[model samples]
Target: MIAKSFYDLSAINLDGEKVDFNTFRGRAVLIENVASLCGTTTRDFTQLNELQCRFPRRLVVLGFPCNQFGHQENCQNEEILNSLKYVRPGGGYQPTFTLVQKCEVNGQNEHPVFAYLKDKLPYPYDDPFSLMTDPKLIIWSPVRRSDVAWNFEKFLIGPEGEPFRRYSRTFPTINIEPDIKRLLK
Candidate 1:
């Protein structure tokens, strides 16, 4: 029963417990598919963590680990956590934002939440030049009309759980600060 609103969906956490999407009601959300081995993993988490730290009350940044791209995140959640700690390299590398269970972002086994999100907001850019030049990309780029192109693609949900802005994986997370700032206000 998919509709305009996304609050009705629920997903599991990295720990494998069910989490109700409605639980985040009244908070602006930035949801992205994360991959530890990807080039942008550290940067994505760094900027996302900063946003969470800056607006702890008003914002909720959720990371959904995926391996659909180059199998970049093909590891256990504990290993993923350890990897992030390594990426951050500070005394307290733990992020306040939630890291949900890893799952597929596209294809038959795609997570339901992601299925809805992709259908509603496809990647705004053309098939990336990188993908265009790679002959092996034909298999990966099958659902470009709606499927996620790569890891770290983002979707912004408003306080009421309405999907607001959609950002491609290439979109600088820092550039999103202004949009987030505007939403918080």
Candidate 2:
């Protein structure tokens, strides 16, 4: 599907509702491919919630669970929420943002939303360290240079629905605040 704009796409949320991208208009959106079992899961989720809280009206944070990287999110779609609430970032830490259902962010089945963002802003660096180096850990085939390197990789979309920036998996979620602030203004 060729999307003319970021708002032209849609995705299914964890509750099985079809969310239209049009709803995000007039706000900066931070989209991330998340994983429950990854090392940074707790920190990422905590700070992600903070980002949402800090800019409730101007910024919308969206998380999509992906298992292509090291099989980190190895749970059924139905079990995801519980895993976060009871296991990983447990202690009743529910995300204030939207978390879509699990989807492949790379290879043949890459989600259109990601495909669009990557097409606009391919990974800025040529050398994507670690994960890409180990073929066994990467479940996707026909990996492209723009493929999401790992879980937590983010794509920032402008208020007008244009892909603004792409952040690597390891990039601290909190550090994205300044960029989002600029876009909001």
Candidate 3:
């Protein structure tokens, strides 16, 4: 499946409902590959929720749960919501934005949406996994330099549904506020 535009992509939400990207038109979208057990999980989730609340009308945050990064999010699809609600970052924290079902973000099985985003905006910096030599940690076969290095890597899309910027996993989520403001304008 080829996506001619960002809006051409669609993903299945946790409820098994298909969500079209066209619905996100006219709003800046931040798409992130998320995990529950990563070091930045709590901070990412909290800050992401804050971003959603901060620009309720201008921005839409979409999270795709992925376990390919060291199996950080190894859990059943049905268990994800509750895991977020009652477990990690658990004090009754519920996301205001949308969360798609778990999916691979790298290798041949990667989601089409991710494939399109990476094709458009490859990782800007040096190879993120250059320091890691462990096959167990890296996972994903035929890994490319553009493959997502870790959970929480983000891709920002403009209101026109054009892919804008791609941030590394270590990049602070709050730091994306400026970029979001620029796109919203």
Candidate 4:
């Protein structure tokens, strides 16, 4: 039997509280490996909040801050908390729809929860959205596993915690909106 899904792991939220992911069972979830400095960072934070509020009752969007990619999220949890406060422009506020799970997410010491998803996700090289495909590159991106390319890489988990869809940063979150709307409703 498979030991445990990533959902079994405990993670620290931006506020420094530990969160148990298993609480998400029986609900659909959009889990992302995110970074503060990645090219897609802003969009990932913005659109995800939109989607969260849009489907508040049926889904939860979780963001895991990872620094494995060139220390993109190098700031310690406290600093990250402050930066995210500024993530929104002027007086504007995005719903705290995000579950900020902070941790190092790549390499042999990578959070096991993330290491698993990294192995499971497709490189999308042949994907129309992909400029190229390289499972080897995907597999070896780090010593522990080739893993996720960069920030905003996503994995959608079904109501049962099964991975539904894993899309690259290139896949527009809006493009997948319709499909998700159908599933949750």
Q: Write one digit per residue (lDDT tens) for candidate 1, span 51-126.
A: 8898888888888988878788877877778777765333446767889988887766788888778766665442
C-alpha RMSD (angstroms) for model 1? 2.8
The 10 consecutive residues of candidate 3 with the worst lDDT sum are: 124-133
For each candidate, what TM-score against the reference?
0.86, 0.94, 0.93, 0.77
Q: How many steric overlaps are in each model, in order?
A: 0, 0, 0, 6
Report how far residue 49 has shifted in candidate 2, in Å. Answer: 0.5
lDDT of 3 by residue, 1-185 (tens): 55888988999999999989889989999999999778898899999989999999889899999998879898888988788888987888788888999999899899999999988987734234442556578778878878887888899999998888888876888899999999887
Write model 2 residue lDDT over 60-158, tens digit each, in one string. Answer: 899999998889998888999899999999999798989998999898899999888889878733234444666677668777877888788888889
Q: Which model, 2 or 3, shows the larger TM-score?
A: 2
Superposition-based RMSD of candidate 4 using all C-alpha atoms, in angstroms: 4.0
Model 3 whole-model lDDT (C-alpha atoms): 0.87
Give candidates' CA RMSD values in order.
2.8, 1.7, 1.8, 4.0
Candidate 4: list runs displaced more than 4 Å. 1-3, 87-95, 122-146
- Which tens-of-lDDT digit does each residue in 1-185 have in candidate 4? 12268577666676667778778777787778877666776677778888788878778788888776556787676666456556532134343565565665555566766766655554433242442254443332344324566666777767776766777767776566765765666
